[PDB]
Amino acid sequence: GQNPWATTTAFADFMKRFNIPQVHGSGIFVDLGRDTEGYREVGGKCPVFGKAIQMHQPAEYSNNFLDDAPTSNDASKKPLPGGFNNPQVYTSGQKFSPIDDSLLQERLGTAGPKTAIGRCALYAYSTIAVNPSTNYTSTYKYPFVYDAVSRKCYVLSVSAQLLKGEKYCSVNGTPSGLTWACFEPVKEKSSARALVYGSAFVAEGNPDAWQSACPNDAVKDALFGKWEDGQCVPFDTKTSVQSDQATNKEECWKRVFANPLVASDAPTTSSPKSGGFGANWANFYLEKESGETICAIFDQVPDCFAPITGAVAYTALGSSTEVNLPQCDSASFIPIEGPCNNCVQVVTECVGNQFDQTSKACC
Amino acid sequence: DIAQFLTDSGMKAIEDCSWNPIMQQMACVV
């Protein structure tokens, strides 16, 4: 009765992704983990799946945050129209952002990162801000957003992620007068765009590391838990921050991102740094008690997975797409041969941490 | 002012240009 999630390479490697403070190390909801040159900087190590900025510019405004950010601070404009995408142009006459992922690979080549996310993070990281006058450079780096549908890399020029309150922003034209319109992050699952928001520091070191290293996906048929008395005990709704009923599985996914205790670096009332600590993990499951589905947000770092049919364990960082647990460790797992009946037996192996049963004939 | 709070929300006034070694061009605000 040792814990295989701590013990075994296949299981450990997986469970490691679900220490957010260690693998991400910053606010998720708002990521303002670093500071540079007297500013706040998006710093988090893991990329964030489904994150987008909802805006509250008036209806006439396009209200997309991937729009070219407002180019010349306009007087007759209040609030200031546009989005967050860097609006600069190359000498070529080509827009700095967004860029195709195609364009990236050709120019990046073999030496460059494999993942397109890696590739786009590196675009952002690669970028140096310069003053044409007084030739001056900055080490300040901006967050990228990657659209997985269309395969475009956007570099933003707006590290802000949340703006709230009528002293500072306008909701829906009101109070008119104010330059900035309110915005807040939201996990969104359109079929038309598929966004991933990240720090440019995903690209620092090895840009493809997230893939192996981060809680990128939702897990199907499993529940976060601590390991007690030789077995994995699902965090129960009693030590959860909130465990309200939740209509469906995708609803739980959005709730974790937004819930009021999720790791977040936004200013209270002052540059708060969460280090990733907060209600970031949630269990979705059907209560055996009056059978109402529950979304169970926790702040406890799980160290194992309790497997259960039809369950889903989500995190504030990860995708909405479900994915299997590892069933075995290739390295350690001895192939087991079932009883030879009919001169044929099923034989079970561990190709890529999953059971492939392939039936063989003993005689 | 209040804009103490806006910098403290991640707001930063960009610089006119960028250099990118992947494209090896200078991109500037039009």
Author numbering:
A (entry chain A): 96 to 364, 383 to 476
B (entry chain B): 999 to 1028
Pull text from the paper.
The co-structure of sporoAMA1 with sporoRON2-D3 reveals significant complementarity, with a buried surface area of 3274 Å2, 23 intermolecular hydrogen bonds, and a complexation significance score of 1.00 indicating physiological relevance. Nearly three quarters of the hydrogen bonds formed between sporoAMA1 and sporoRON2-D3 are found within the cysteine loop region, and only the strictly backbone interactions are observed at the generic AMA1-generic RON2sp interface, which contains approximately half the number of hydrogen bonds observed for generic AMA1 and the generic RON2 cysteine loop. Firstly, sporoRON2 Met1009 buries into a deep cleft in the side of sporoAMA1, while the corresponding residue in generic RON2 is Gly1307 and there is no cleft in this region of generic AMA1 due to the presence of Met233. Secondly, beta-hairpin loop 3 is four residues shorter in sporoAMA1 than generic AMA1, which together with the introduction of a glutamic acid residue in this loop (sporoAMA1 Glu132), presents an enlarged pocket with sufficient shape and charge complementarity to accommodate an extended lysine residue of sporoRON2 (sporoRON2 Lys1010). The C-terminus of sporoRON2-D3, for example, does not extend the length of the groove as observed in the generic AMA1-RON2sp co-structure, but rather exits the groove shortly after the disulfide of the beta hairpin loop.
AMA1, a type I transmembrane protein, is conserved across all Apicomplexans and its knockdown has been shown to markedly reduce invasion. Recently, Toxoplasma sporozoites were subjected to detailed transcriptomic and proteomic analyses. It was found that, in addition to the well-characterized “generic” AMA1 and RON2, sporozoites also express two paralogues dubbed sporoAMA1 and sporoRON2, respectively, that are not expressed at detectable levels in tachyzoites or bradyzoites. To better understand the mutually exclusive nature of the interaction between the sporozoite and generic AMA1/RON2 pairings, we set out to solve the crystal structure of apo sporoAMA1 and of sporoAMA1 bound to a portion of sporoRON2-D3 (sD3).
